[model samples]
Target: MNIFEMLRIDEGLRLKIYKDTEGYYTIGIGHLLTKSPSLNAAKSELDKAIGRNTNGVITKDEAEKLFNQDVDAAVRGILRNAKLKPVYDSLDAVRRAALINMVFQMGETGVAGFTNSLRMLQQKRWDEAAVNLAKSRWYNQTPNRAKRMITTFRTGTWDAYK
Candidate 1:
């Protein structure tokens, strides 16, 4: 499966625009997952807790914090079901963070099923991996997030896409 196939976002929900009482416009899921300031607030908090700078660059310390804050439970969950530590061993901080971010946004099963992208990383095909990362159905769905991740993977930098 590809990243988009694993994410299942396109399959699960379509996209929509919504306005809040404050007259702020945001994207939502399938016209059902309405975007709210609260959701943005949660994302901001998560970003900060992960030590993401204003530019969304995560330093080593931030990366560590992000791992601790985000993956403990998920790791434990995986461990409880099996003893395959090697599956999680080869990941670097950035790759781990990206995985965690995707899993956190989606879920364990969602992340697990991303076979193609995961295999690309497993083979150390950095450029191809980055391309596979961007060529998801979910990419066009949220062009902003997809572009940012692609740029980060390619240049080790961050930029807003939307």
Candidate 2:
């Protein structure tokens, strides 16, 4: 499956402003409205995307656009990362999508801390990589997503979604 499908399931679609688990003002599929280019710019873009001033609302089409932009940026950041690039290149596409999903959830810097897991993945040690990934506070915060990622890393398949 594609990253968009996975993200749609993980982040879910929202058409109105709401607070994320971290209390950030978020909208349109986990877009951080509070930390965007600027709140005004974000609002302006949202307005443009919906073809009207929506105040704190978004349409499904507009949400998909933001998701595309966010996911693209995350992929670029992952590929450009000095430490992550090599490890990412070592994996198959499914596993690569797992890495992308990880970065999507917790930025490059956040995932960078998974030094052991990254090393195991590079070495093609799937079990070790999964073990390393599970041993983290991120697992505690989002256990199901983390488990899916770990399963994806270990199995080299799209069974994570199943």
Candidate 3:
């Protein structure tokens, strides 16, 4: 099932769906939805969420599924704009999922700003990458969430969501 289908519109969940000029459904958080941002805006938020939650990579297919699209051409376009091809080529499935989750929360630019973490990953400094990942405004904003992702990256094992 798609993410929106799983987390449908409800009193407890804050989500917004808007249509582009071409009439494609673009989903976004309620806060961003209020502003009626474009698909590019929504992409930024999703990218940040993914970046913080994993080691900074997500597949086009995963993006299509989560955004409720049969073809993720739009999402892929956004990733391509951000020059994430290299990252996508290198990360594992689990890590990619985690990154997508982070990007969904943090936005593309926010995730891009983590120079230290990206560098550490490139250098294969696992511990330093974990440390760098944890040292962010995103980390300070969501300690428990950050800790969980860090743990996953560090030990290569974490509790699976039910």
Candidate 4:
């Protein structure tokens, strides 16, 4: 009935490292050891703590604590952009989620480059906003996600996601 207990159940506490269903080495709860440049420094420190091994052991308490901290930081990062926040927070729940997802995928600086698109959204010109987003290099890089974002956002419905 408590927060720690709930997280413990949800995360499935494990005392040792092992690959998850996807075969990426993970340890303690559901932490995925996916290699990214940003994670390198932290991972190096962790490696030093245990040894020169990717499959390092950890505890349930540490796992849950780390997850909490990481999610908190991510949420703060998503909400920190003042220029983007006004337009972003005005959207429907799903659209706000999509916007946050994009912010997470591309940093605030990267997302800020879409000046026209942000302006269109700020002005509540949904059609123009969608079109502006579609014309970007980000769209070409991730069309499947792009299509879903553009189609549903302009039309004001999540029906296109499926």
Best by lDDT: 2
Residue 107: error of model 2 in Å? 0.5
Cα miss at 139, model 2 (Å)? 0.3
Q: What's the distance in Å from true for residue 119, model 2?
A: 0.6
Query: Which parts of model 4 have CA positions greater than 4 angstroms off?
Result: 1-53, 56-74
TM-score of 4: 0.58
C-alpha lDDT values of all predictions: 0.47, 0.84, 0.50, 0.62
Q: Per-residue lDDT for 5-116 in model 4, tens only?
A: 3234434666665555445455565555553333454465456544555445565566666556544544577577777777677777656655655554455787877888
TM-score of candidate 2 to 2 decimals? 0.88
Model 4 lDDT-worst window of ten: 1-10
The candidate scoring highest on TM-score is: 2
Query: What ranking of all candidate models by lDDT puts the best one first?
Result: 2, 4, 3, 1
Better candidate by TM-score, 1 or 2: 2
Report the Cα lDDT for residue 26, model 1: 26
lDDT of residue 11 for candidate 2: 86
Residue pairs that clash (backbone atoms under 3 angstroms), model 2:
none
lDDT of each residue in 81-156, candidate 2, tens digit only: 9999999888899899999988988899999889988998999999987887888999988899889888988998
Ranking by TM-score: 2, 4, 3, 1
